[PDB]
Amino acid sequence: CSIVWFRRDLRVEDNPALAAAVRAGPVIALFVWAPEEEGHYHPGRVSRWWLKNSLAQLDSSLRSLGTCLITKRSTDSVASLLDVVKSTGASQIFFNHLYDPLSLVRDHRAKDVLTAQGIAVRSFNADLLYEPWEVTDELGRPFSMFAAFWERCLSMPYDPESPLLPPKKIISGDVSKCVADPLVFEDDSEKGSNALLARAWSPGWSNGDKALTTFINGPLLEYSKNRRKADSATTSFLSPHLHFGEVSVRKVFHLVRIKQVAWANEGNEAGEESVNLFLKSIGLREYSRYISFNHPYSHERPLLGHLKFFPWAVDENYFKAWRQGRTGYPLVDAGMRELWATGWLHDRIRVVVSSFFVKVLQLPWRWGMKYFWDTLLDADLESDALGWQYITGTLPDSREFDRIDNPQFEGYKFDPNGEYVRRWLPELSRLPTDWIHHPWNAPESVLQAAGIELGSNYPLPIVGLDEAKARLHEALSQMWQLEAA
Numbered sequence: 001c002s003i004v005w006f007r008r009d010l011r012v013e014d015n016p017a018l019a020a021a022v023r024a025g026p027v028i029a030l031f032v033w034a035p036e037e038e039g040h041y042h043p044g045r046v047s048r049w050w051l052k053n054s055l056a057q058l059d060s061s062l063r064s065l066g067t068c069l070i071t072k073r074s075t076d077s078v079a080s081l082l083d084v085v086k087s088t089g090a091s092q093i094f095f096n097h098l099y100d101p102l103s104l105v106r107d108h109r110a111k112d113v114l115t116a117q118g119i120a121v122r123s124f125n126a127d128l129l130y131e132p133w134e135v136t137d138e139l140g141r142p143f144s145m146f147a148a149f150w151e152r153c154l155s156m157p158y159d160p161e162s163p164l165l166p167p168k169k170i171i172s173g174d175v176s177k178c179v180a181d182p183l184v185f186e187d188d189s190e191k192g193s194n195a196l197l198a199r200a201w202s203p204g205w206s207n208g209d210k211a212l213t214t215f216i217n218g219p220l221l222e223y224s225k226n227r228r229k230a231d232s233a234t235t236s237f238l239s240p241h242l243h244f245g246e247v248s249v250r251k252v253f254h255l256v257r258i259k260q261v262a263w264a265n266e267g268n269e270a271g272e273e274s275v276n277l278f279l280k281s282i283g284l285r286e287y288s289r290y291i292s293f294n295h296p297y298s299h300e301r302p303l304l305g306h307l308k309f310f311p312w313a314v315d316e317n318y319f320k321a322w323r324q325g326r327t328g329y330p331l332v333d334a335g336m337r338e339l340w341a342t343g344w345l346h347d348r349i350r351v352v353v354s355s356f357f358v359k360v361l362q363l364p365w366r367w368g369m370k371y372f373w374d375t376l377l378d379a380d381l382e383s384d385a386l387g388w389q390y391i392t393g394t395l396p397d398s399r400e401f402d403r404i405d406n407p408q409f410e411g412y413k414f415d416p417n418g419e420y421v422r423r424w425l426p427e428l429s430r431l432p433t434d435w436i437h438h439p440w441n442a443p444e445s446v447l448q449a450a451g452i453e454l455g456s457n458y459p460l461p462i463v464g465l466d467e468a469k470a471r472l473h474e475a476l477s478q479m480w481q482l483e484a485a
C-alpha cells in the first residue's frame, strides 16, 4: 500500500508523486477537501465549480487506469491523512509541493505528524520548471527582480525534467473504500449562477491538453501582435487549468521551446517575439511562486515598505462602485462587469481595473486581491498577490507610484472602436465611438439618442482624474509627514 495525496496537481501525465507511488506498490488516490483550513481564502464560487468538474474528470481518468479517487470531507487534512492510513494500512504518502503561504505551513505540519508516526513521506515538483531554491544568483541569494530571475531560469546548467507518461496501469489498495465522502461545491443559489460556465469552459486535464494544443498550433504565432486585444481568443486560456495542476508547465515549456527552435530556424521574427512574450508569461507564474516561497506572508504583507504610512481611502461605496462597475469610466466598468458575470479577465483589463483601484479610488490592495480571489475562475494566491503588489507599487519592479492611468486613453489603446465597452455595458450599446470612452463630455443630443442619462443608467466619473491626482499628492504629503516619527 501507498497513498497519493492530490491537492492542485489534478492530472495523470507528468505527475511525479503518482509515478513514484505506482513504482512502489498499489495506490490509494486521495483528495481531501478542507476549506475552513484555508482561512480568509477559501475557494470562491467559480473556482469551486471548476474544481468540482476537474475532480470528476480526474476520477474518471484514474478509473480508466485501474483505481478510483477517494474523496474526504474534513476540517483537517492532516488528520484525514492519518485516519486514511490508519484504516488502510499504508506506509508511504506521496504528494507534490505547493508554495502558497497556507499550504507551506500545513504541509510541514503534515510531514512532521506523519513521519513522526511511522509514515514515509516523499515530495516532488509538479508545479514548476525548477524549485525556487534551484534558481538563484551567483552568490546564492534569491533574485529580487523578475528579469534577473527569469534570465537565470532560461540559462540554467540543466533542463527542466521532461514530461513523464502517465501510468499504464495502477493497482488499487482497497477498492472497498471507493465509495467515500460526497463533496458539495455548489449551493442551489450558486448552481444558478454557474449555469453558463459549462458553455465556455471544460475543466480537467484532458481539455487542458486540448487547450494547450490549440494555442501552440494557432494563436501563439500572433501572441505578441495581439497583446492589446481586450476580449479575444488571442491567449492560451490555460490559467484555470494551470492553477489546479491539470496541465504541466514543464510540458508547456517543452512544446514552446520546440516551436521557438523551429521559428528561429525559419527566421520568423513575429514568432520568436511571440514566443518570448509567452515564455515571459510562463515566467511570471514561476516568479509568483518564487516570491511566495521567499516571503511567506506576501499575500498580505508587502515586500517594499516605502508605502507604509500611506493614508489609503477606506471608503465603502467607492469599493461598491468598483465592484458594480459603476465608476464612470467605460473601460473600467466594462471590466468589472465581465468579471462579475463570467469570472474571466484578460490580463490587460486586470491591470486597468486594479490600477484604477489603487490610484484613482486609492483603496487597500488587500481588498482588490480578495475580491479577485472570490470571483476569478483562475483565482491563484500567488499570481493574485504578485499582480496586486505590482500594480500598487510595493514591488522592487513596480512602475512609478505617483502615476495615474487615464481610462479614456487606455480605452483608445485596448478598445479603439468601443467594441469591448459595448459588449459589457448594454447601457452604452448605442453610444458612438467618438464618446464611448468618455461619455460625460458627449453632447446632450448624442446621449439622448443613445438612451443614456448620465447619473442614471450610467454614472458620472465617481472621482475625476484631476481630483484624483490631487488627493494622491495630498496623501503623499501626509505619509511623508507621518514618516517623520
Ligand SMILES: Cc1cc2nc3c(=O)[nH]c(=O)nc-3n(C[C@H](O)[C@H](O)[C@H](O)COP(=O)(O)OP(=O)(O)OC[C@H]3O[C@@H](n4cnc5c(N)ncnc54)[C@H](O)[C@@H]3O)c2cc1C
Binding pocket: 235, 236, 237, 238, 239, 240, 242, 243, 278, 281, 282, 283, 284, 285, 288, 345, 346, 347, 348, 350, 351, 354, 372, 376, 378, 379, 380, 381, 383, 384, 385, 386, 387, 388, 391
Ligand atoms: C491584478 C492582477 C491579478 C491577477 N490574478 C491572477 C490570478 O488570480 N490567477 C492567475 O493565474 N493569474 C492572475 N493574474 C495574471 C494574468 O492576468 C492571468 O494569469 C492571465 O490573464 C490568464 O490568461 P491566460 O491563461 O490566457 O494567460 P496567457 O497569456 O495565455 O499566458 C499563459 C500563462 O502564463 C501565466 N501568466 C500570464 N501572465 C501572468 C501574470 N501577469 N502573472 C502571473 N502569471 C501569468 C498564467 O499561468 C497564464 O495562464 C493577475 C494579474 C493581475 C495584473
Ligand SMILES: CC[N+](C)(C)CCCS(=O)(=O)[O-]
Binding pocket: 200, 201, 202, 203, 207, 208, 210, 211, 232, 233, 237, 238
Ligand atoms: C476563449 C477561451 N475559452 C473558449 C473561453 C476557454 C477555453 C476552453 S477550455 O476550458 O477547454 O480551456
Ligand SMILES: [Cl-]
Binding pocket: 306, 401, 402
Ligand atoms: Cl513613492
Ligand SMILES: [Mg+2]
Binding pocket: 223, 226, 227, 228, 229, 230, 234, 235
Ligand atoms: Mg492578447
Ligand SMILES: [Mg+2]
Binding pocket: 226, 229, 230, 231, 232, 233, 234, 235, 346
Ligand atoms: Mg484577446
Ligand SMILES: [Mg+2]
Binding pocket: 347, 351
Ligand atoms: Mg501583467
